[PDB]
């Protein structure tokens, strides 16, 4: 079997960072060159794996995380980073074993008048642990006090991204796919 990587990287719709989705890959054969040499990606950084030697390996499972972030936020999708994105939306471990691919999608997720459908969490009591997801959506309060706007000192936790087809590249939409390679005792089922 040939792994459903086209189903992931060419998926029609992508979720917001705070609501990042994960798909697990398994019992298949994965040709990584199909993405390793594409001029398609503006970002293709691997950790403790080396993009090239990819194919020449085996793994029990491969997990793929998908989401959309601002251009200037792609940098936060790496181990040891901090910021609204890394701390409250999606974080990578420190001993990360995988690759992070990103590509500009202005003509797809951007709009002339502006697309604000993609959001990110900017308020949260404590940050996330590697690979932790939070889709709570509960009116935030500095003192963890349950409130309801227009109440004072009560703000919604999610803020909107403003994606236009006319802003700088850094304010443009980027689709990201985080490949996480799992090495468990059970023999491999996903090799080249």
């Amino acid at each position, epitope marked *: 079997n040939l792994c459903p990587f086209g189903e992931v990287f060419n998926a029609t719709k992508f979720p917001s960072v705070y609501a990042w989705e994960r798909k697990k890959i398994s019992n298949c054969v994965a040709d990584y060159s199909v993405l390793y040499n594409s*001029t398609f*990606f*503006s*970002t293709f950084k691997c950790y403790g794996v080396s993009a090239t030697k990819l194919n020449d390996l085996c793994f029990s499972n491969v997990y793929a995380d998908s989401f959309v972030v601002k*251009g*200037d936020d*792609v*940098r936060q999708i790496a181990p040891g980073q901090t910021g609204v994105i890394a701390d409250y939306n999606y974080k990578l471990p420190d001993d990360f074993m995988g690759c992070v691919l*990103a590509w500009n999608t*202005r003509n797809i997720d951007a709009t002339s008048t*502006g697309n604000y459908n993609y959001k990110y969490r900017y308020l949260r009591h404590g940050k996330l642990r590697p690979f932790e997801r939070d889709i709570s959506n509960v009116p935030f309060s500095p003192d963890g006090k349950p409130c309801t706007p227009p109440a004072l000192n009560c703000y919604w936790p999610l803020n909107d991204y*403003g994606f*236009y*087809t*006319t*802003t*700088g*590249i*850094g*304010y443009q939409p980027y689709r990201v796919v985080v490949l996480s390679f799992e090495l468990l005792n059970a023999p491999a089922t996903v090799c080249g």
Partner: antibody
Amino acid sequence: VQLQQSGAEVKKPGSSVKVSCKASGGTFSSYTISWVRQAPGQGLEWMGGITPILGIANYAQKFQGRVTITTDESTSTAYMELSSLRSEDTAVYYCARDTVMGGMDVWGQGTTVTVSS
Amino acid sequence: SYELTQPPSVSVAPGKTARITCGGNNIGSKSVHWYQQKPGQAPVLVVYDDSDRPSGIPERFSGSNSGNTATLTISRVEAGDEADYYCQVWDSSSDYVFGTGTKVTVLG
């Protein structure tokens, strides 16, 4: 389109300066303005930028902490304020419209800023 | 920190073509921009997105990008083409990066 910048300035080390950039149209619409500086006989260097319509700015690693890019309420004028001035900061400051592909399109005439005692 | 590399100089006799190279890690995956800046003037975009000319720039200016080398080509150089030429790109980690710049001199 065209960009109009504020006049030349002179500042004592340690103080701060704030340059303005006004679109010849009256508004920046839905595009992004960038700030680039060039010290005498030196090269070009990106300092940061802002997308007026979004009200969100961005800065370069090097000037993180010393620079503040903003817009006026009407959103028709962008400002660049640099703090803790030093002689090494003596240079020509330009504002420029960001291309859609990661470059600069329209450049302002530039604002000469001299830092000295 | 992403870096770009340009030769400091380039000499060419009139009417001949001058070539300026910009080096960078897999710069072909990036959208290269070239700026022309004459003595005491402001920069001018001569080539954007690798090889497109903004309206108003002579067809003599053309660029190319592939691998780890982007190139600015100026056919039939004129004395008026003397200036500093800068290449530039945007990187997700370093924002907008400019090359050290290349000074073009016309001989004879």
